[PDB]
UniProtKB/Swiss-Prot annotation, chain A:
Its cofactor is Zn(2+). Homodimer. Changing C59A: No effect on NO-mediated modification. Its EC number is 4.4.1.5. Belongs to the glyoxalase I family. The modification S-glutathionyl cysteine is found at C137. Changing S43A: No effect on phosphorylation. This is Lactoylglutathione lyase. Keywords: Acetylation, Disulfide bond, Glutathionylation, Lyase, Metal-binding, Phosphoprotein, Zinc.
Length: 182, 177
C-alpha cells in the first residue's frame, strides 16, 4: 500500500532521464571548478609543487578585494604572451581550477572555508588521474601532504584522498586499474 | 595584506616535477538529492553526456559521470568503458545517497552562503546571450542573467540542487567590466 523508499535508479531509469545534446549546446565545455582559498601562497605552492599544475592566469579586482588564480595541467609554453590572447586562452581550457582569494583571510585566525564533507554537505572533492597511485602517494608522504584516505585503507584499494591547504578533498586514482577493484 | 603581486604569485609557483607527468584533473564531485532531476538538467539543459553509472548497493549510493563527450566514443566493453570514463578531462561526478529524494527536509548546501567553500562550476559557451535565452525559455533558475548586476556578458544559473553554474564566453572578457 505505502510507496517504497526510493533506492538507486536502474540503468534503464537513468537513461530514461538523459536527453541527447541540443545543437545549441554543441561547443559548450566544462571549463572550471571554483574553490575559495584562505591563503593563496599556500594553495599556489600546493597545486604547483605537489600536484604539478600550472598557474595560467591571475586576475585582481581591487574594488571587490579579491583575486582569482587559474590553474590547469597545461604546458607553460602554450601560454600566449599577449594579454588579451592570454585571457581568452586561459579561460577557454577544459578542466581548470579557479582559486578565489578574498583579501585578508590569510591574516584572520578565526576564518576558514568549509570543505563540504561534514554538515552541511554539498560539494565533495576534485579528482586527479595519475599513472601510479602508490608511487604518487609515496611522494605525497615524503612531502608532508595530509591524507583523508591512504591507498590501502578502507574498502576501496588503490584509491586515495589527500587534502589541500584549506582542507578540500582530492581524489587520487589510476583509471587503468579501477575495473579490477570493482 | 591586500592581494599578491604578480611577482609574488609566480615566486610561490614551482615547475611541474617529472613525477607529475601525465597527471590530469579528471573530476569535480557534487552530491545530488535527486538523480532523475540532475540527469535531466545536465543532459537536456547543459548538453552533457552520461558516460558511466556505478552503483554501490552495500554503501547505498550511486555515481553518475557526466562530460562533454561524443556518446559514440563510449567504449562498448565494460572494463574498457570504466577506464575511459575515469580518464576523461573535465568530468562531472554526481553522488546520490539513496533515499534523499524522499526526505523533504533534506537538501545539499551550495557553498555560496555560510559556511562557504566551493562556489561554482563553469561552462564556456560561444554566446552567453543566446545560451541564456534558451535557458530562460526552459525555465532554468538564474542567480544572475548576463546583464544583471556589475559584470556584463556573464551569467550564473542553478542546477536542481541549487549549485551555481557560471556561463561565460571566453572571447568576450573586454566588456566584462
Ligand atoms: C577572468 C575573469 C573570470 C570571470 C570573472 C567572474 S568573477 C565572478 C564573481 N566572483 C566573485 O565575486 C568571487 C569573490 C567573492 N567574494 C566570493 O567569495 O565569491 C561572482 O561570484 N559573481 C557572482 C554574483 O554576481 O553573484
Ligand atoms: C568507478 C569508481 C570511481 C571511484 C569510486 C570511489 S567513490 C569515493 C567514496 N564516495 C562516497 O563514499 C560517496 C557516498 C558518501 N555517502 C558521500 O555522500 O560522500 C568516498 O568518499 N570514499 C572516501 C573515504 O574513504 O573517506
Ligand atoms: Zn568562476
Ligand atoms: Zn570522486
Amino acid at each position: 500500500e505505502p510507496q517504497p523508499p526510493s533506492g538507486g535508479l536502474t540503468d534503464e531509469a537513468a537513461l530514461s532521464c538523459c536527453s541527447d545534446a541540443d545543437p545549441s549546446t554543441k561547443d559548450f565545455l566544462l571549463q572550471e571548478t571554483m574553490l575559495r582559498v584562505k591563503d593563496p601562497k599556500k594553495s599556489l605552492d600546493f597545486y604547483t609543487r605537489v600536484l604539478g599544475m600550472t598557474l595560467i592566469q591571475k586576475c585582481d579586482f581591487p574594488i571587490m578585494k579579491f583575486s582569482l588564480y587559474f590553474l590547469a595541467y597545461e604546458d607553460k609554453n602554450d601560454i600566449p604572451k599577449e594579454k588579451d590572447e592570454k585571457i581568452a586562452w586561459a579561460l577557454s581550457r577544459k578542466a581548470t581550477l579557479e582559486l578565489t582569494h578574498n583579501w585578508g583571510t590569510e591574516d584572520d585566525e578565526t576564518q576558514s572555508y568549509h570543505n563540504g564533507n561534514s554538515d552541511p554537505r554539498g560539494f565533495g572533492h576534485i579528482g586527479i588521474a595519475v599513472p601510479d597511485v602508490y608511487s604518487a602517494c609515496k611522494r605525497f608522504e615524503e612531502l608532508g601532504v595530509k591524507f583523508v584516505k591512504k591507498p590501502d585503507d578502507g574498502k576501496m584499494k588503490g584509491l586515495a584522498f589527500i587534502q589541500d591547504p584549506d582542507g578540500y578533498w582530492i581524489q587520487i586514482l589510476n583509471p587503468n586499474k579501477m575495473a579490477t577493484l570493482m
